[PDB]
Design a protein around this ligand. Sequence first.
Ligand SMILES: *[C@@H]1O[C@H](CO[C@H]2O[C@@H](C)[C@@H](O)[C@@H](O)[C@@H]2O)[C@@H](O[C@@H]2O[C@H](CO)[C@@H](O[C@@H]3O[C@H](CO[C@H]4O[C@H](CO)[C@@H](O)[C@H](O)[C@@H]4O[C@@H]4O[C@H](CO)[C@@H](O[C@@H]5O[C@H](CO)[C@H](O)[C@H](O)[C@H]5O)[C@H](O)[C@H]4NC(C)=O)[C@@H](O)[C@H](O[C@H]4O[C@H](CO)[C@@H](O)[C@H](O)[C@@H]4O)[C@@H]3O)[C@H](O)[C@H]2NC(C)=O)[C@H](O)[C@H]1NC(C)=O
Ligand SMILES: *[C@H]1O[C@H](CO[C@H]2O[C@@H](C)[C@@H](O)[C@@H](O)[C@@H]2O)[C@@H](O[C@@H]2O[C@H](CO)[C@@H](O[C@@H]3O[C@H](CO[C@@H]4O[C@H](CO)[C@@H](O)[C@H](O)[C@@H]4O[C@@H]4O[C@H](CO)[C@@H](O[C@@H]5O[C@H](CO)[C@H](O)[C@H](O)[C@H]5O)[C@H](O)[C@H]4NC(C)=O)[C@@H](O)[C@H](O[C@H]4O[C@H](CO)[C@@H](O)[C@H](O)[C@@H]4O)[C@@H]3O)[C@H](O)[C@H]2NC(C)=O)[C@H](O)[C@H]1NC(C)=O
Lengths: 206, 207
Amino acid sequence: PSVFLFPPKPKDTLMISRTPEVTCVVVDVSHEDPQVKFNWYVDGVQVHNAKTKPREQQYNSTYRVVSVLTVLHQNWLDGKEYKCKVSNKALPAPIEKTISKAKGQPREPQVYTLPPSREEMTKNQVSLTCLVKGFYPSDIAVEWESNGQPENNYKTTPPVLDSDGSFFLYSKLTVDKSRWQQGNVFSCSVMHEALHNHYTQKSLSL
Amino acid sequence: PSVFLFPPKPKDTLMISRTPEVTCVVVDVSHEDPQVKFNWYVDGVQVHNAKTKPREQQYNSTYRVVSVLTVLHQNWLDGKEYKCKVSNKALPAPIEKTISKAKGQPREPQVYTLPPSREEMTKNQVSLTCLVKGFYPSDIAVEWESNGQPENNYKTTPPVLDSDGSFFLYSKLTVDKSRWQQGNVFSCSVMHEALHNHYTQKSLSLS
Ligand SMILES: *[C@@H]1O[C@H](CO[C@H]2O[C@@H](C)[C@@H](O)[C@@H](O)[C@@H]2O)[C@@H](O[C@@H]2O[C@H](CO)[C@@H](O[C@@H]3O[C@H](CO[C@H]4O[C@H](CO)[C@@H](O)[C@H](O)[C@@H]4O[C@@H]4O[C@H](CO)[C@@H](O[C@@H]5O[C@H](CO)[C@H](O)[C@H](O)[C@H]5O)[C@H](O)[C@H]4NC(C)=O)[C@@H](O)[C@H](O[C@H]4O[C@H](CO)[C@@H](O)[C@H](O)[C@@H]4O)[C@@H]3O)[C@H](O)[C@H]2NC(C)=O)[C@H](O)[C@H]1NC(C)=O
Ligand SMILES: *[C@H]1O[C@H](CO[C@H]2O[C@@H](C)[C@@H](O)[C@@H](O)[C@@H]2O)[C@@H](O[C@@H]2O[C@H](CO)[C@@H](O[C@@H]3O[C@H](CO[C@@H]4O[C@H](CO)[C@@H](O)[C@H](O)[C@@H]4O[C@@H]4O[C@H](CO)[C@@H](O[C@@H]5O[C@H](CO)[C@H](O)[C@H](O)[C@H]5O)[C@H](O)[C@H]4NC(C)=O)[C@@H](O)[C@H](O[C@H]4O[C@H](CO)[C@@H](O)[C@H](O)[C@@H]4O)[C@@H]3O)[C@H](O)[C@H]2NC(C)=O)[C@H](O)[C@H]1NC(C)=O
């Protein structure tokens, strides 16, 4: 019988337009007593329910009850400590787990655009590169767009811990060498808290 | 009592010169029954010992026995399944764990060198990029060098699963803009099974 707390997507917390949420996943809940009682304390407060919501889920022969808590963007951003107290009669002591964003002065992520190297132009598809470096915390999202429209064929490394104490990563957009050669312009959208409006956009084009 | 199987370093299995090996680490071995019996099966066979070797070690109040088995570069490379059967009296059923090279046809990596972006030359240190793409399995190693000399100020993202089913990654070398501008030449070395001699080199330089 175990509890697992998860923080919200970096993106979810950096855009007021969307709803961030912290989940309290509970594993190995036997059938001989599946009733699980959740409790959420935001920075020590709120024994009394607020905005929570869980639901059932059957698995390997065990259970996975999941309670969700809707967070306030600034709350999370201002390092509030979220706690989830899980209770089960199959447990002597309730399970308490806390979660808050990483601690430490935030750092503006430098964003760059790297075009397909010469040697790669001998293929039918080329890779556009966006180097996102020097940012802290690790919370971050990256996207690509051409003429104001999304792009699907791309992938982004998870963040990597650099030398100073900042992180970095690369997002690779792959598109037919023609499009790139047809002069089209693409753009890497980066969303980080330490950024102005939590969003900066960098363009790429031959 | 728990067993943990560890594969060899990617380098170890790509250079005949080196000795790769698979480790079978056991933890939570009590004092009232420290007796630990290992068994190694290479693709199902060899219950009867061969080339293994373990030894004792005391920890927080439990034990940590560790058996090591030396593999043959080819076997590993050829996806042989290495099994470690750990046995202990304080255990109902022995513990069986297997480990081997990832299943799927190998893929030759593409090494591309990316110079520092214009916008990045407004700094004291620049980033040289090495994009290693379309490789499989993910086992791999990347390093950097200037005039035949190593380089330490670099970092390499863990492999990433691509759309095809291939992997990719980037390795970033950080060098003072001067060196970059003094015309200096660097090279990222990529070692992979599906390469020729298991190693290709790509150079980077401004001009
Ligand atoms: C009592 O103490 C026990 C151990 O004591 C240690 O605790 C410290 C805090 C100190 O107090 C000190 O006494 C000791 O350091 C403790 O046991 C722990 O039990 C854990 C589980 O309960 C177990 O966790 C697993 O760890 C795996 C990773 O292990 C590697 O990494 C750690 C550190 O990151 C390292 O310490 C280990 O030795 C392992 O490191 C690797 O070791 C192999 C073999 O030596 C190396 O193999 C290379 O092979 C090549 C062949 O070509 C070459 O030969 C090369 O030279 C070799 O090195 C390898 O290089 C090396 N890598 C590193 C780290 O550099 C996780 O992988 C594992 O995660 C899996 O499993 C979990 C579930 O269990 C899943 O959730 C995961 O998804 C995943 O599948 C898991 O986390 C600890 O390893 C173990 N402690 C250690 C450090 O050994 C015990 O719990 C305590 N008593 C109690 C309360 O139970
Ligand atoms: C049978 O029941 C389950 C079965 O599990 C699976 O395998 C088999 C058994 C199969 O039959 C099937 O049931 C399942 O496929 C077993 O329970 C497992 O127990 C282990 C340990 O007890 C748990 O391990 C932990 O895993 C977390 C990682 O989190 C999970 O990742 C996996 C895959 O990566 C995923 O399947 C899970 O659902 C979790 O993923 C995360 O889930 C949260 C919850 O929604 C998401 O939250 C996001 O929140 C944002 C907020 O804004 C938004 O809401 C998003 O929408 C929302 O997604 C996350 O996004 C999501 N992650 C991803 C990838 O997106 C580890 O972190 C954790 O590690 C820690 O503990 C280790 C020790 O155990 C330790 O060594 C580590 O150092 C670390 O401290 C831990 O490993 C399993 O999660 C769990 N299985 C699952 C999936 O629930 C059970 O054991 C079996 N029976 C038995 C034998 O009891």
